[PDB]
């Protein structure tokens, strides 16, 4: 249900935050996942291409440091930002390729 | 969720990158808006609560530096992440405020 003045931006954000809950049916969810875990999840969740250059390296070292650490939603954010900045959907990603 | 075999996580990312285009009409966008502009636009898009403390500071100065300048999706990402860090909607999201 909904009855709030949401807008597409808000909707994107509410989707992300709720998706930590609706991860793959996940009760007792804390914040986000673990850091390396996250890296392995995103490459799965994004089947599209994984061309990943530039921030690939940045993120790789960031995980390498202490991936044992928990990730948290705000940091997750930056990291998937970097992931978009890496894996740039050509236009119509849902096309798969053709 | 979609049909290539992409998951809800990736689903959110395509929605964000889309929504730069589906912002407020232009014949194909660049990367994001101007920094300051971006901050006001997200404020407008998120009427939800706007309690904004913590990353209010990080983000305020981050904008201030050269807030005029063109923002790109990379920076934008972190910044809306910080916005989630700030407005920690969490539970009472669709509950709005009143």
Q: What residue ranges do the domains of chain A occupy? A: 1-98
Reading the block at residue B15, the tokens are 């929605």
Reading the block at residue A88, the tokens are 């740039």
DSSP symbol at A31: S
**What is A1-98's CATH superfamily?**
EF-hand (1.10.238.10)
C-alpha distances in Å from residue A24, one per residue of A2, B1, B10, B84 = 22, 11, 13, 22
C-alpha distances in Å from residue A35, one per residue of A59, A67, A71, A97 = 10, 5, 5, 29
Complete DSSP assignment for B9-76: HHHHHHHHHHHHHSSS--SS--S--BHHHHHHHHHHH--S-----SHHHHHHHHHHHTTTSBP-HHHH
For residue A15, report the phi and psi dihedrals to the nearest 5 degrees: -55, -55
CA distance B75 to chain A (A): 8
Q: Which residue has the tokens 């309690």?
A: B51
Contacts of A42 in chain B (CB under 8 A): 9-10
**Is A12's CB within 8 Å of B15's CB?**
yes
**Is A89's CB within 8 Å of B12's CB?**
no
CB contact at 8 A, A72 and A31: yes
Asked if residue A14 belongs to a known ligand binding site, the reply is no
How crowded is residue B76: how many other Cβ atoms within 10 Å of its Cβ? Answer: 20
C-alpha distances in Å from residue A49, one per residue of A86, A90, B88 = 10, 10, 32
Residue A7: which of B7, B45, B74 has the nearest Cβ?
Answer: B45
Asked if residue A64 belongs to a known ligand binding site, the reply is yes
What approach was used to elucidate this structure?
NMR
């Amino acid at each position: 249900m909904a009855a709030e003045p949401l807008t597409e931006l808000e909707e994107s954000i509410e989707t992300v935050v709720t998706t930590f809950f609706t991860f793959a049916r996940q009760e007792g969810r804390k914040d986000s996942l673990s850091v390396n875990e996250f890296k392995e999840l995103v490459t799965q969740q994004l089947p599209h291409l994984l061309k990943d250059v530039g921030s690939l390296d940045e993120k790789m070292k960031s995980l390498d440091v202490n991936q044992d650490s928990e990730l948290k939603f705000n940091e997750y954010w930056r990291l998937i930002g970097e992931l978009a900045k890496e894996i740039r959907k050509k236009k119509d990603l849902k096309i798969r390729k053709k």
